[PDB]
Structures are given as structure tokens and as C-alpha cells.
PDB file of all heavy atoms in Angstrom:
ATOM      1  N   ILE A  28     -68.865  26.998  20.741  1.00 52.90           N
ATOM      2  CA  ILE A  28     -69.683  28.015  20.103  1.00 52.90           C
ATOM      3  C   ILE A  28     -68.988  29.384  20.341  1.00 52.90           C
ATOM      4  O   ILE A  28     -68.496  29.621  21.458  1.00 52.90           O
ATOM      5  CB  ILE A  28     -71.123  27.982  20.696  1.00 52.90           C
ATOM      6  CG1 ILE A  28     -71.858  26.707  20.219  1.00 52.90           C
ATOM      7  CG2 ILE A  28     -71.913  29.210  20.311  1.00 52.90           C
ATOM      8  CD1 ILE A  28     -73.292  26.580  20.757  1.00 52.90           C
ATOM      9  N   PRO A  29     -68.909  30.237  19.314  1.00 53.01           N
ATOM     10  CA  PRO A  29     -68.148  31.492  19.445  1.00 53.01           C
ATOM     11  C   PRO A  29     -68.688  32.277  20.635  1.00 53.01           C
ATOM     12  O   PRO A  29     -69.891  32.530  20.742  1.00 53.01           O
ATOM     13  CB  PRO A  29     -68.397  32.219  18.113  1.00 53.01           C
ATOM     14  CG  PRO A  29     -68.629  31.143  17.131  1.00 53.01           C
ATOM     15  CD  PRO A  29     -69.407  30.059  17.935  1.00 53.01           C
ATOM     16  N   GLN A  30     -67.810  32.594  21.562  1.00 53.36           N
ATOM     17  CA  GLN A  30     -68.271  33.091  22.842  1.00 53.36           C
ATOM     18  C   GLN A  30     -68.820  34.515  22.810  1.00 53.36           C
ATOM     19  O   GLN A  30     -69.618  34.880  23.692  1.00 53.36           O
ATOM     20  CB  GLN A  30     -67.143  32.987  23.874  1.00 53.36           C
ATOM     21  CG  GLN A  30     -66.821  31.530  24.209  1.00 53.36           C
ATOM     22  CD  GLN A  30     -65.474  31.385  24.895  1.00 53.36           C
ATOM     23  OE1 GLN A  30     -64.486  30.949  24.276  1.00 53.36           O
ATOM     24  NE2 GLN A  30     -65.411  31.771  26.170  1.00 53.36           N
ATOM     25  N   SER A  31     -68.403  35.325  21.838  1.00 54.21           N
ATOM     26  CA  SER A  31     -68.809  36.724  21.853  1.00 54.21           C
ATOM     27  C   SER A  31     -70.000  37.052  20.975  1.00 54.21           C
ATOM     28  O   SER A  31     -70.407  38.205  20.901  1.00 54.21           O
ATOM     29  CB  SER A  31     -67.625  37.637  21.461  1.00 54.21           C
ATOM     30  OG  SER A  31     -67.365  37.599  20.078  1.00 54.21           O
ATOM     31  N   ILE A  32     -70.575  36.062  20.305  1.00 51.69           N
ATOM     32  CA  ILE A  32     -71.750  36.366  19.487  1.00 51.69           C
ATOM     33  C   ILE A  32     -73.015  36.529  20.333  1.00 51.69           C
ATOM     34  O   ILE A  32     -73.037  36.263  21.548  1.00 51.69           O
ATOM     35  CB  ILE A  32     -71.956  35.297  18.415  1.00 51.69           C
ATOM     36  CG1 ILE A  32     -72.319  33.952  19.076  1.00 51.69           C
ATOM     37  CG2 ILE A  32     -70.692  35.244  17.515  1.00 51.69           C
ATOM     38  CD1 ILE A  32     -72.533  32.812  18.030  1.00 51.69           C
ATOM     39  N   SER A  33     -74.096  36.984  19.700  1.00 54.36           N
ATOM     40  CA  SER A  33     -75.317  37.224  20.480  1.00 54.36           C
ATOM     41  C   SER A  33     -75.923  35.960  21.068  1.00 54.36           C
ATOM     42  O   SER A  33     -75.731  34.856  20.550  1.00 54.36           O
ATOM     43  CB  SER A  33     -76.384  37.910  19.609  1.00 54.36           C
ATOM     44  OG  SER A  33     -76.822  37.034  18.582  1.00 54.36           O
ATOM     45  N   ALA A  34     -76.722  36.139  22.113  1.00 52.50           N
ATOM     46  CA  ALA A  34     -77.438  35.018  22.691  1.00 52.50           C
ATOM     47  C   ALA A  34     -78.284  34.376  21.599  1.00 52.50           C
ATOM     48  O   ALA A  34     -78.395  33.142  21.529  1.00 52.50           O
ATOM     49  CB  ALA A  34     -78.315  35.470  23.868  1.00 52.50           C
ATOM     50  N   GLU A  35     -78.855  35.207  20.721  1.00 57.45           N
ATOM     51  CA  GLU A  35     -79.791  34.677  19.709  1.00 57.45           C
ATOM     52  C   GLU A  35     -79.047  33.792  18.707  1.00 57.45           C
ATOM     53  O   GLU A  35     -79.549  32.736  18.277  1.00 57.45           O
ATOM     54  CB  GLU A  35     -80.518  35.800  18.953  1.00 57.45           C
ATOM     55  CG  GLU A  35     -81.530  36.579  19.779  1.00 57.45           C
ATOM     56  CD  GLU A  35     -80.937  37.795  20.483  1.00 57.45           C
ATOM     57  OE1 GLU A  35     -79.703  37.913  20.602  1.00 57.45           O
ATOM     58  OE2 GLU A  35     -81.718  38.650  20.942  1.00 57.45           O
ATOM     59  N   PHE A  36     -77.862  34.247  18.316  1.00 59.31           N
ATOM     60  CA  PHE A  36     -77.064  33.490  17.350  1.00 59.31           C
ATOM     61  C   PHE A  36     -76.492  32.237  18.052  1.00 59.31           C
ATOM     62  O   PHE A  36     -76.399  31.163  17.450  1.00 59.31           O
ATOM     63  CB  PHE A  36     -75.976  34.382  16.743  1.00 59.31           C
ATOM     64  CG  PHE A  36     -75.336  33.802  15.494  1.00 59.31           C
ATOM     65  CD1 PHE A  36     -76.011  32.921  14.701  1.00 59.31           C
ATOM     66  CD2 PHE A  36     -74.030  34.122  15.164  1.00 59.31           C
ATOM     67  CE1 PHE A  36     -75.435  32.369  13.570  1.00 59.31           C
ATOM     68  CE2 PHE A  36     -73.435  33.558  14.040  1.00 59.31           C
ATOM     69  CZ  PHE A  36     -74.140  32.680  13.241  1.00 59.31           C
ATOM     70  N   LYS A  37     -76.135  32.354  19.327  1.00 61.91           N
ATOM     71  CA  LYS A  37     -75.711  31.159  20.053  1.00 61.91           C
ATOM     72  C   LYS A  37     -76.819  30.111  20.086  1.00 61.91           C
ATOM     73  O   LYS A  37     -76.554  28.928  19.898  1.00 61.91           O
ATOM     74  CB  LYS A  37     -75.308  31.479  21.491  1.00 61.91           C
ATOM     75  CG  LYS A  37     -74.035  32.272  21.605  1.00 61.91           C
ATOM     76  CD  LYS A  37     -73.556  32.319  23.046  1.00 61.91           C
ATOM     77  CE  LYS A  37     -72.329  33.212  23.123  1.00 61.91           C
ATOM     78  NZ  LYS A  37     -71.865  33.356  24.535  1.00 61.91           N
ATOM     79  N   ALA A  38     -78.054  30.544  20.350  1.00 61.88           N
ATOM     80  CA  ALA A  38     -79.160  29.591  20.383  1.00 61.88           C
ATOM     81  C   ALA A  38     -79.365  28.964  19.007  1.00 61.88           C
ATOM     82  O   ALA A  38     -79.629  27.778  18.888  1.00 61.88           O
ATOM     83  CB  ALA A  38     -80.465  30.262  20.880  1.00 61.88           C
ATOM     84  N   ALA A  39     -79.225  29.767  17.956  1.00 59.20           N
ATOM     85  CA  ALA A  39     -79.358  29.240  16.611  1.00 59.20           C
ATOM     86  C   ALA A  39     -78.296  28.170  16.315  1.00 59.20           C
ATOM     87  O   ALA A  39     -78.614  27.104  15.782  1.00 59.20           O
ATOM     88  CB  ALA A  39     -79.281  30.363  15.616  1.00 59.20           C
ATOM     89  N   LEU A  40     -77.038  28.433  16.640  1.00 57.17           N
ATOM     90  CA  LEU A  40     -76.004  27.420  16.395  1.00 57.17           C
ATOM     91  C   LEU A  40     -76.141  26.164  17.253  1.00 57.17           C
ATOM     92  O   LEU A  40     -75.837  25.064  16.779  1.00 57.17           O
ATOM     93  CB  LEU A  40     -74.610  27.995  16.621  1.00 57.17           C
ATOM     94  CG  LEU A  40     -74.279  29.152  15.703  1.00 57.17           C
ATOM     95  CD1 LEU A  40     -72.848  29.653  16.062  1.00 57.17           C
ATOM     96  CD2 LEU A  40     -74.394  28.768  14.227  1.00 57.17           C
ATOM     97  N   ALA A  41     -76.576  26.335  18.503  1.00 56.29           N
ATOM     98  CA  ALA A  41     -76.642  25.224  19.450  1.00 56.29           C
ATOM     99  C   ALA A  41     -77.686  24.232  18.999  1.00 56.29           C
ATOM    100  O   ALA A  41     -77.559  23.026  19.218  1.00 56.29           O
ATOM    101  CB  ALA A  41     -76.970  25.731  20.853  1.00 56.29           C
ATOM    102  N   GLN A  42     -78.726  24.749  18.366  1.00 55.42           N
ATOM    103  CA  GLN A  42     -79.908  23.937  18.105  1.00 55.42           C
ATOM    104  C   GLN A  42     -79.900  23.349  16.717  1.00 55.42           C
ATOM    105  O   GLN A  42     -80.703  22.491  16.393  1.00 55.42           O
ATOM    106  CB  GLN A  42     -81.150  24.775  18.333  1.00 55.42           C
ATOM    107  CG  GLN A  42     -81.189  25.307  19.767  1.00 55.42           C
ATOM    108  CD  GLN A  42     -82.427  26.113  20.065  1.00 55.42           C
ATOM    109  OE1 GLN A  42     -83.475  25.908  19.453  1.00 55.42           O
ATOM    110  NE2 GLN A  42     -82.317  27.038  21.014  1.00 55.42           N
ATOM    111  N   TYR A  43     -78.965  23.798  15.901  1.00 56.15           N
ATOM    112  CA  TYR A  43     -78.855  23.326  14.531  1.00 56.15           C
ATOM    113  C   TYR A  43     -78.096  21.986  14.478  1.00 56.15           C
ATOM    114  O   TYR A  43     -76.951  21.887  14.926  1.00 56.15           O
ATOM    115  CB  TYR A  43     -78.163  24.408  13.684  1.00 56.15           C
ATOM    116  CG  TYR A  43     -78.149  24.167  12.185  1.00 56.15           C
ATOM    117  CD1 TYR A  43     -79.269  24.443  11.408  1.00 56.15           C
ATOM    118  CD2 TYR A  43     -76.999  23.703  11.544  1.00 56.15           C
ATOM    119  CE1 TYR A  43     -79.260  24.242  10.036  1.00 56.15           C
ATOM    120  CE2 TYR A  43     -76.974  23.493  10.182  1.00 56.15           C
ATOM    121  CZ  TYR A  43     -78.107  23.766   9.422  1.00 56.15           C
ATOM    122  OH  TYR A  43     -78.094  23.557   8.054  1.00 56.15           O
ATOM    123  N   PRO A  44     -78.732  20.942  13.935  1.00 57.99           N
ATOM    124  CA  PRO A  44     -78.009  19.670  13.828  1.00 57.99           C
ATOM    125  C   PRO A  44     -77.103  19.634  12.586  1.00 57.99           C
ATOM    126  O   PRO A  44     -77.547  19.263  11.490  1.00 57.99           O
ATOM    127  CB  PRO A  44     -79.137  18.642  13.719  1.00 57.99           C
ATOM    128  CG  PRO A  44     -80.218  19.391  12.996  1.00 57.99           C
ATOM    129  CD  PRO A  44     -80.128  20.828  13.476  1.00 57.99           C
ATOM    130  N   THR A  45     -75.839  20.010  12.769  1.00 57.66           N
ATOM    131  CA  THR A  45     -74.899  20.149  11.653  1.00 57.66           C
ATOM    132  C   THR A  45     -74.334  18.797  11.179  1.00 57.66           C
ATOM    133  O   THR A  45     -73.762  18.029  11.965  1.00 57.66           O
ATOM    134  CB  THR A  45     -73.722  21.080  12.036  1.00 57.66           C
ATOM    135  OG1 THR A  45     -74.226  22.265  12.694  1.00 57.66           O
ATOM    136  CG2 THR A  45     -72.901  21.458  10.798  1.00 57.66           C
ATOM    137  N   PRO A  46     -74.468  18.517   9.875  1.00 59.02           N
ATOM    138  CA  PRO A  46     -73.929  17.269   9.328  1.00 59.02           C
ATOM    139  C   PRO A  46     -72.415  17.215   9.485  1.00 59.02           C
ATOM    140  O   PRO A  46     -71.787  18.280   9.391  1.00 59.02           O
ATOM    141  CB  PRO A  46     -74.323  17.334   7.833  1.00 59.02           C
ATOM    142  CG  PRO A  46     -75.342  18.416   7.728  1.00 59.02           C
ATOM    143  CD  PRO A  46     -75.057  19.380   8.834  1.00 59.02           C
ATOM    144  N   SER A  47     -71.853  16.024   9.706  1.00 60.72           N
ATOM    145  CA  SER A  47     -70.411  15.822   9.628  1.00 60.72           C
ATOM    146  C   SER A  47     -69.909  16.026   8.192  1.00 60.72           C
ATOM    147  O   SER A  47     -70.706  15.985   7.242  1.00 60.72           O
ATOM    148  CB  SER A  47     -70.040  14.421  10.103  1.00 60.72           C
ATOM    149  OG  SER A  47     -70.345  13.443   9.112  1.00 60.72           O
ATOM    150  N   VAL A  48     -68.603  16.239   8.024  1.00 61.30           N
ATOM    151  CA  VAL A  48     -68.026  16.302   6.672  1.00 61.30           C
ATOM    152  C   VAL A  48     -68.251  14.985   5.911  1.00 61.30           C
ATOM    153  O   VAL A  48     -68.551  14.977   4.715  1.00 61.30           O
ATOM    154  CB  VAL A  48     -66.520  16.636   6.711  1.00 61.30           C
ATOM    155  CG1 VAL A  48     -65.903  16.551   5.328  1.00 61.30           C
ATOM    156  CG2 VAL A  48     -66.307  18.060   7.330  1.00 61.30           C
ATOM    157  N   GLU A  49     -68.130  13.870   6.624  1.00 60.96           N
ATOM    158  CA  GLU A  49     -68.291  12.575   5.993  1.00 60.96           C
ATOM    159  C   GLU A  49     -69.727  12.407   5.503  1.00 60.96           C
ATOM    160  O   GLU A  49     -69.962  11.923   4.409  1.00 60.96           O
ATOM    161  CB  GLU A  49     -67.911  11.451   6.986  1.00 60.96           C
ATOM    162  CG  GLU A  49     -66.442  11.543   7.490  1.00 60.96           C
ATOM    163  CD  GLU A  49     -66.096  12.826   8.319  1.00 60.96           C
ATOM    164  OE1 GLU A  49     -66.942  13.344   9.099  1.00 60.96           O
ATOM    165  OE2 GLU A  49     -64.958  13.330   8.167  1.00 60.96           O
ATOM    166  N   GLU A  50     -70.688  12.821   6.318  1.00 60.65           N
ATOM    167  CA  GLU A  50     -72.090  12.797   5.908  1.00 60.65           C
ATOM    168  C   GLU A  50     -72.296  13.647   4.660  1.00 60.65           C
ATOM    169  O   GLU A  50     -72.906  13.219   3.686  1.00 60.65           O
ATOM    170  CB  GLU A  50     -72.996  13.308   7.021  1.00 60.65           C
ATOM    171  CG  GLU A  50     -73.402  12.247   8.026  1.00 60.65           C
ATOM    172  CD  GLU A  50     -74.221  12.810   9.171  1.00 60.65           C
ATOM    173  OE1 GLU A  50     -74.407  14.041   9.229  1.00 60.65           O
ATOM    174  OE2 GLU A  50     -74.668  12.023  10.027  1.00 60.65           O
ATOM    175  N   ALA A  51     -71.779  14.858   4.695  1.00 60.93           N
ATOM    176  CA  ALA A  51     -71.998  15.756   3.574  1.00 60.93           C
ATOM    177  C   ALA A  51     -71.307  15.247   2.319  1.00 60.93           C
ATOM    178  O   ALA A  51     -71.776  15.502   1.210  1.00 60.93           O
ATOM    179  CB  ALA A  51     -71.531  17.183   3.918  1.00 60.93           C
ATOM    180  N   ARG A  52     -70.207  14.515   2.464  1.00 59.73           N
ATOM    181  CA  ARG A  52     -69.627  13.869   1.289  1.00 59.73           C
ATOM    182  C   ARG A  52     -70.430  12.629   0.931  1.00 59.73           C
ATOM    183  O   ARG A  52     -70.432  12.217  -0.228  1.00 59.73           O
ATOM    184  CB  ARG A  52     -68.155  13.473   1.497  1.00 59.73           C
ATOM    185  CG  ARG A  52     -67.216  14.663   1.636  1.00 59.73           C
ATOM    186  CD  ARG A  52     -65.749  14.343   2.042  1.00 59.73           C
ATOM    187  NE  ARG A  52     -64.926  15.528   1.717  1.00 59.73           N
ATOM    188  CZ  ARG A  52     -63.761  15.859   2.285  1.00 59.73           C
ATOM    189  NH1 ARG A  52     -63.228  15.089   3.237  1.00 59.73           N
ATOM    190  NH2 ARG A  52     -63.129  16.971   1.902  1.00 59.73           N
ATOM    191  N   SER A  53     -71.113  12.063   1.933  1.00 57.83           N
ATOM    192  CA  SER A  53     -71.612  10.677   1.904  1.00 57.83           C
ATOM    193  C   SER A  53     -72.360  10.378   0.632  1.00 57.83           C
ATOM    194  O   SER A  53     -72.099   9.348   0.012  1.00 57.83           O
ATOM    195  CB  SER A  53     -72.504  10.364   3.109  1.00 57.83           C
ATOM    196  OG  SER A  53     -73.861  10.707   2.863  1.00 57.83           O
ATOM    197  N   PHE A  54     -73.286  11.248   0.239  1.00 58.82           N
ATOM    198  CA  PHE A  54     -73.529  11.322  -1.186  1.00 58.82           C
ATOM    199  C   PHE A  54     -74.202  12.552  -1.751  1.00 58.82           C
ATOM    200  O   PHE A  54     -74.592  13.505  -1.066  1.00 58.82           O
ATOM    201  CB  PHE A  54     -74.289  10.086  -1.690  1.00 58.82           C
ATOM    202  CG  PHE A  54     -73.809   9.636  -3.045  1.00 58.82           C
ATOM    203  CD1 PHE A  54     -72.447   9.519  -3.281  1.00 58.82           C
ATOM    204  CD2 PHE A  54     -74.695   9.311  -4.064  1.00 58.82           C
ATOM    205  CE1 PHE A  54     -71.974   9.123  -4.508  1.00 58.82           C
ATOM    206  CE2 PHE A  54     -74.224   8.893  -5.304  1.00 58.82           C
ATOM    207  CZ  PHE A  54     -72.861   8.798  -5.523  1.00 58.82           C
ATOM    208  N   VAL A  55     -74.309  12.440  -3.064  1.00 56.07           N
ATOM    209  CA  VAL A  55     -74.285  13.513  -4.015  1.00 56.07           C
ATOM    210  C   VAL A  55     -75.051  13.007  -5.219  1.00 56.07           C
ATOM    211  O   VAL A  55     -74.801  11.891  -5.699  1.00 56.07           O
ATOM    212  CB  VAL A  55     -72.848  13.867  -4.432  1.00 56.07           C
ATOM    213  CG1 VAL A  55     -72.883  14.818  -5.568  1.00 56.07           C
ATOM    214  CG2 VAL A  55     -72.090  14.477  -3.278  1.00 56.07           C
ATOM    215  N   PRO A  56     -76.013  13.797  -5.698  1.00 53.08           N
ATOM    216  CA  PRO A  56     -76.749  13.317  -6.863  1.00 53.08           C
ATOM    217  C   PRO A  56     -75.846  13.118  -8.072  1.00 53.08           C
ATOM    218  O   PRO A  56     -74.973  13.946  -8.350  1.00 53.08           O
ATOM    219  CB  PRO A  56     -77.761  14.444  -7.121  1.00 53.08           C
ATOM    220  CG  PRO A  56     -77.908  15.131  -5.829  1.00 53.08           C
ATOM    221  CD  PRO A  56     -76.561  15.058  -5.174  1.00 53.08           C
ATOM    222  N   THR A  57     -76.062  12.027  -8.793  1.00 50.80           N
ATOM    223  CA  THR A  57     -75.374  11.828 -10.052  1.00 50.80           C
ATOM    224  C   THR A  57     -76.349  11.499 -11.198  1.00 50.80           C
ATOM    225  O   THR A  57     -75.921  11.262 -12.324  1.00 50.80           O
ATOM    226  CB  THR A  57     -74.327  10.705  -9.945  1.00 50.80           C
ATOM    227  OG1 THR A  57     -74.975   9.476  -9.592  1.00 50.80           O
ATOM    228  CG2 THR A  57     -73.281  11.060  -8.873  1.00 50.80           C
ATOM    229  N   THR A  58     -77.648  11.486 -10.917  1.00 49.22           N
ATOM    230  CA  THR A  58     -78.645  11.214 -11.959  1.00 49.22           C
ATOM    231  C   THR A  58     -79.770  12.229 -11.919  1.00 49.22           C
ATOM    232  O   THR A  58     -79.776  13.129 -11.081  1.00 49.22           O
ATOM    233  CB  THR A  58     -79.259   9.817 -11.820  1.00 49.22           C
ATOM    234  OG1 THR A  58     -79.950   9.718 -10.561  1.00 49.22           O
ATOM    235  CG2 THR A  58     -78.175   8.738 -11.906  1.00 49.22           C
TER     236      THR A  58
END
């Protein structure tokens, strides 16, 4: 986590469950 950002922004990033690239590719609406 970027070390010099605010405590508040650190808490926001730490707690966010970020999808993997593979997940985000995993699918995509086509209909």
C-alpha cells in the first residue's frame, strides 16, 4: 500500500476487496 498516503486512504485501500485481472476478464456481458 503506498506508504505516504493518508491513514484514511490507506484504510480505504486495505479494506477494498480488489478483483484479480483474471477475474475482471473472467467475464463480460455479451447479451
Side-chain angles (χ1 to χ4, degrees):
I28 289 180
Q30 292 163 255
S31 75
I32 66 180
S33 66
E35 290 90 344
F36 195 26
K37 291 191 184 177
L40 299 179
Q42 301 182 27
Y43 189 80
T45 314
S47 76
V48 174
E49 300 63 36
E50 274 176 356
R52 293 172 163 156
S53 87
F54 218 47
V55 171
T57 61
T58 62

